[PDB]
Design an enzyme around this catalytic site. Sequence first.
Site, mmCIF file in Angstrom:
data_model
loop_
_atom_site.group_PDB
_atom_site.id
_atom_site.type_symbol
_atom_site.label_atom_id
_atom_site.label_comp_id
_atom_site.label_asym_id
_atom_site.label_seq_id
_atom_site.Cartn_x
_atom_site.Cartn_y
_atom_site.Cartn_z
ATOM 1 N N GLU B 42 19.617 44.197 68.767
ATOM 2 C CA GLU B 42 20.760 43.345 68.471
ATOM 3 C C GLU B 42 22.058 44.063 68.806
ATOM 4 O O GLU B 42 22.241 45.225 68.430
ATOM 5 C CB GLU B 42 20.752 42.956 66.995
ATOM 6 C CG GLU B 42 21.922 42.096 66.565
ATOM 7 C CD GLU B 42 21.878 41.769 65.089
ATOM 8 O OE1 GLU B 42 20.921 42.198 64.414
ATOM 9 O OE2 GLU B 42 22.807 41.097 64.598
ATOM 10 N N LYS B 129 23.857 32.763 67.224
ATOM 11 C CA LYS B 129 23.419 32.989 65.857
ATOM 12 C C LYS B 129 23.913 31.861 64.966
ATOM 13 O O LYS B 129 25.055 31.413 65.092
ATOM 14 C CB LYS B 129 23.921 34.341 65.353
ATOM 15 C CG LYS B 129 23.328 34.771 64.028
ATOM 16 C CD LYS B 129 23.715 36.191 63.670
ATOM 17 C CE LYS B 129 23.102 36.595 62.343
ATOM 18 N NZ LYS B 129 23.436 37.989 61.960
ATOM 19 N N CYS B 163 18.853 38.670 62.981
ATOM 20 C CA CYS B 163 18.589 39.483 61.791
ATOM 21 C C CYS B 163 18.167 38.717 60.544
ATOM 22 O O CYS B 163 17.026 38.842 60.098
ATOM 23 C CB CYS B 163 19.830 40.308 61.460
ATOM 24 S SG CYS B 163 19.635 41.355 59.999
#
Lengths: 289, 289, 289, 289, 289, 289
Positions: B42, B129, B163
């Site tokens: 990431e 995201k 995440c």
Amino acid sequence: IVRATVVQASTVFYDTPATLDKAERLLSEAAENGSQLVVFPEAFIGGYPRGSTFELAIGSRTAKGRDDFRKYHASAIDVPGPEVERLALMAKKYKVYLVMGVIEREGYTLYCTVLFFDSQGLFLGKHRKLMPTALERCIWGFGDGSTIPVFDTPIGKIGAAICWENRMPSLRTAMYAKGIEIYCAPTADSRETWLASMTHIALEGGCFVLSANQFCRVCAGGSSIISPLGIVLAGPNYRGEALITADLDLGDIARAKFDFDVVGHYSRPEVFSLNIREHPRKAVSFKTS
Amino acid sequence: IVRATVVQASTVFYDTPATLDKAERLLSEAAENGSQLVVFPEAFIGGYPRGSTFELAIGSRTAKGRDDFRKYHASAIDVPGPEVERLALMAKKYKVYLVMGVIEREGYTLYCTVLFFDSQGLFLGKHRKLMPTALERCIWGFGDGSTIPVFDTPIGKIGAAICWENRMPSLRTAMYAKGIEIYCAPTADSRETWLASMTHIALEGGCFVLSANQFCRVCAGGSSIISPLGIVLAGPNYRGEALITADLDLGDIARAKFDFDVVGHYSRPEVFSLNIREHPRKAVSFKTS
Amino acid sequence: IVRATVVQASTVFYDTPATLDKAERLLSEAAENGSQLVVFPEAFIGGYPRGSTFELAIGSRTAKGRDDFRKYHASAIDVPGPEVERLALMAKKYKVYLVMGVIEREGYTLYCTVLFFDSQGLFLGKHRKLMPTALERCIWGFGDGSTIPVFDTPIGKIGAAICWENRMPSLRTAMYAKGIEIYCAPTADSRETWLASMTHIALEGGCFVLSANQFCRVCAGGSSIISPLGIVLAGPNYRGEALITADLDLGDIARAKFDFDVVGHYSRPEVFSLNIREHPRKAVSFKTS
Amino acid sequence: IVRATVVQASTVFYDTPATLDKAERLLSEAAENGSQLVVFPEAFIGGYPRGSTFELAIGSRTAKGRDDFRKYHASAIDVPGPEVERLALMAKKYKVYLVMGVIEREGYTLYCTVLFFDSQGLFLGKHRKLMPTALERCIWGFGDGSTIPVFDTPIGKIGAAICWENRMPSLRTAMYAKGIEIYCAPTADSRETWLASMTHIALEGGCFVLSANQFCRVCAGGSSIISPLGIVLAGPNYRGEALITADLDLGDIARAKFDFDVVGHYSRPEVFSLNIREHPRKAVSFKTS
Amino acid sequence: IVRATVVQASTVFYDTPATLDKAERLLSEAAENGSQLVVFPEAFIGGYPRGSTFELAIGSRTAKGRDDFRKYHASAIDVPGPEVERLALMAKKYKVYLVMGVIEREGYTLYCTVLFFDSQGLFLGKHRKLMPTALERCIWGFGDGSTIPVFDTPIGKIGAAICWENRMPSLRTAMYAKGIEIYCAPTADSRETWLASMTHIALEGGCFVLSANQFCRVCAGGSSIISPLGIVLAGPNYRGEALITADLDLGDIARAKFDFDVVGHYSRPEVFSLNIREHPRKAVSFKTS
Amino acid sequence: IVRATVVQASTVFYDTPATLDKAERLLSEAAENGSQLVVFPEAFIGGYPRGSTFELAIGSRTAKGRDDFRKYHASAIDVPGPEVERLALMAKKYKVYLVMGVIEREGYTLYCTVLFFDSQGLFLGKHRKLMPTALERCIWGFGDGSTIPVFDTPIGKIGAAICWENRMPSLRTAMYAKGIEIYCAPTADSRETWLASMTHIALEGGCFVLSANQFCRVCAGGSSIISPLGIVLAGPNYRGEALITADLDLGDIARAKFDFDVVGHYSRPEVFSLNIREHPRKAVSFKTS
């Protein structure tokens, strides 16, 4: 701040008034140290048929499956009846909450349900199993949506789930939307991966995961209890059957939902939306005046 | 039957043409042994600001947050542009699939996206995201529903997540309904509980969980790769940065979905029902003839 | 990092080749100190009829409005023509950018437009006025949507607006969605509340508000220039006509959009949505082969 | 013709039944001179955490943010409940209108809402905050579109807004299209530029801007009240806490919308067009018969 | 400022070189007082067949229509040829502008056209008739769209129309969009309502309506000339044939388009839109190399 | 064959319930002789502000325009409401058709509309004014295309127009394409040229031009009624206020469209083509479920 216990004992597998006194002596021995919530494993009263296959090839149906099935059917209970009045009187004599994994009958069927009792000997409700796993489909039954309970107590909100309903995402995000923070989960498997499958629910929730498995003779079950930060309080005792206890700090939830916080302020309502159909559907419905 | 690699390296955190050659030399060194799928962590290109708080009390906004933010904004990319043509040419020279964790800008905003490249140097798409976690809300942006991809390849169907989108139940049961069996998941946390949070997704799915974390200087990340029966092939190397590989038997999925089998034949449609609203919504929409 | 100037001078109100040399001498006197962007006020070339009412009761139409209107119509220009070639040659001789408030005619109408010139003497485009305010409706015309420009330069993106178009919310959030950071705004009113009406646009944007008003004989206009944090660099000089300059740090915008950040990451697209219809509509359209 | 008051007092920041009697004594002391509309500041009942940062680096999450968050969560209210019945009885005993800035909880979340009460002790509705500003995103929640109210009274139409929702252009041109002429705006910042940011809304509207800020110990807030021609009636008292009143002539609006007149006869519908999506969207929706 | 004349004379109806010298002597007698623009009536050279019906019942076609038609066909001209060179030499000898109503042939057809000559004896163009009225359809022809002219002169822009093309709204709003301010209109009817049908065009335009009708033996035509405010300068002389003149102040148009102003700033382009197809279409088109 | 009346009376200019009984007594006095269609002038209910200029120089805006505007705004109506129910009951008591020139408000704007009622007290629709003329732009509003009506009755098809919409060519050829043969046209000017501007529409159409002007104290309006051959039935009574009637032979239209016949068989579709955009466009559009 409460404290809760789980058990790990097994049933005598036949003649259900004999296994109902083990429940009495274990629940009193757990009550001697000021316990307040007692969880029993899956199918503790009716019995869990392990190892037998009932001789089912594809539909041959030999004669040594029928007598085995009727001998298993003759050892189940029915609610409400004379078998739950004794458990209500058992939990009524002093102060304890009681969940219990039984097997009920309803006209030559078998539902793998679970029961809920408060400190005053009342019968709150029940939670039947949604779908049995692989081979239990041949003998057990399917549950409907009008059974998933709320059950708020003066020590918090308690719910339940059974063996492989904890793997569904939709049922757990239907439990979370009601506000469960004490998430009981009886089961009947003994693998190493079950602890790692419970720690994810403990993180995703905010709830004290409080499981229970049975130990007999070797299918050595391991029960545990997990804080909502991923902290195992009382470990996975794989060795023998015993009583397992810990304390539950209920101020450890509003400090745990500062990070994640499911169905509030995550779970974007502008893109996702779930709806549960909860109708008490039955096949034949009589109506009179 | 394919074989895939993950990396664990870190960025130089400033001056993004300098960290773009590390990608070249590592991807060639991973390509020397016939690899076929490479996953990067990431925020590998834009950089991940660790430790700094930008001096935000409640809205005081001191002068040493503004210069820090503009020095961080001056090191991001924009797609499609001159910075992705070099990566397309990088993945085009030989045969490798490529996912990549970058940070894009779009008019003084920062989206933490991820990229997808095939073996012929084409640009398939991107996956922004959905929601940043706690303090990343101050600097990053929110994604919409019209970004979650399908991306079928001639070695299977690949998807992604970032995440703390792996903790949502609704997003994972929206990924499962498209048929993901290679479930890449870059992340940027280093805790012990992350392995136990990935094993649950590996059991609940049927997909090869293939994660990647970075290691810098101590925030020691540990990456791994998990079979769909709960079998860690290459372990969580907490020690240094290296290349981690394994083989992927694609006949180990139709034998793994004999037991559980999510959105088919579990997940009772008569009681539960999910629907995802996927509209490309934008604030100001110009229209001409 | 650039530096820009505004002016505050007035026109001679008649005979437009006479007022076109004042533009030459003032633009050279502003060019002597390395200036790079020069803004002229509203209606500087055509003239702004102040005080006169044209004798309009409700539709009486006395004879002393017609001769006044034709004497005013005989002092306007038309683009492109011989009157803008001189301004293109004026801005071409050295390096300066040029916006200019003129009044154009197009077949016995009057449009209150504004012009845009680069450093090489090219004619970029024009921006007509959307709607005149109260009594200017009797003499001027309405603009359409196919005129609002983008106009990116190698020193940033420049736009414009006229007197009471800065009060619309929809036009400003249509300007912001194109990326304006140097927001020129000529006007022709002289009140105290105009500075407080510009500071709000400077905060809501991120753009250097750069206005200009004229001073004649007493309707004393006050021009200014405002940083995107609410910081007046060069003050509202109400005293006489002069040249007003400041410097423009273009690194003071990405540090100013850390707090608010309009049409990105505020302005929730899931609830609000704007769309602008931009068609070049004309009444009579000839077509041949 | 009515007259309205604002307050400038502060909360005791802990133990919300203690700060609820200050509301009683101040509202009676404001009621002694025939007042008719009382506005309280932002987060007057729940408390506004100033200065604390909760120790959030990037996701370190030290132990002294969790106890601080649960001590802050234990001092919020929930509507409708036993805490708003006392305010309804407070506003019911005599004739006064009441808006009130509180903080509500809904299952371990915090929404920064605002309340509306009439002269008869009814509960009209509420207006949650659309998006918190910079660091309040870590603790508060996002509002949806199905909350922006109309609320016509027999003294006019009243609406509201919170701290940095007054800077959006789209939300204000959604408020103007319903016909607001008494535009309450509580806030919690104390800068000089706030008066110049309110005067623009007072000119762009036609509404009596009626704000309120709090004063504690030094973050000296200044509240005011503005006529729809740009005329400050009662000034920005930066000195101490007091009661601030003025009279409101409701014949000063139809004479103020002779010049500008937003969403009527300006705001050309042939080129611009706005539409607001207002759906009561929720994540999990139970349905029964 | 110009001055223009119209005539009212008639033709000798046969043998077109005889009626071509009347044109010479009348145009010189009109030229003796410094005239500058001369308008002749409809069908002045070819002749206008009045009263005859050609014996057409429904298609009986008796023999006394054919000889009448060929005797009428033998008295028409063809352009450009030997008959327009004499008119070009006529208008070339001194300074006068010339419009002229003739009848042309083109291969056994008859088009009722009109001609245009400048002060230097050039042939600008022609304007055929769009559609004949009621019974003229039997003998005349239809015009196409590629004939309507612009014809700017150094005394203004001149156009034309014929008898019942002035009643169409679409053709007049196609003439107005090119900028006609001297609107010649020959005709061949003599009624009282024609003056009231011309005054409307004079108001709707801004153009000097300048008509001409013929007088013979009793079908007494009346010609006139109208200011663009509805002011008849030289009256409708119903008595005999004569020369009719007036002066034309060209500063009386920009003072007349202060009120109404067609295709500018009225005629809302956002709702109405006209388009004219103007293709030179012909039946048989030869093409070579 | 019907018969229709027009009126010429004036309003009392203030306090609109007082002028609403004049409508009752005049409409009954016109109903005493078997009338069937009654036309009222422009702005008969709201009032027509004559002579006043509101003191508008260029934008000075003195205090004696604001009080004048609010005193004028306080005497307008809103449809549908309590003021049109009385007119519906007025036209319902016996058999009469009713058009009516009123002035409506819609949130501090003023639209100069017109109304339509049948013989059964129904409310058919309304026709707002497209564009006000010169100085009425300062106070009134612009209409859109989705208002021009058809309104077929069992005595023919009736339409309308207001003062200076009869001069547009495009709006009249949009009215003619729907089939209007009773063309009502209220107005508020009193000049000699208005009769000659109506006779052209009567010839160009085929419709009974049926106008109405008001007479007060001297701005002496003259109303009339015109046959479709140019025949004034009841003359332009410039003397006082009265009732004016005539009969309408509806067999005088198919004999009048033998000559000209607009949008049929003239108006060549192969060269001209008009199209009207008719969308109900509004600025802010709320949408819910």
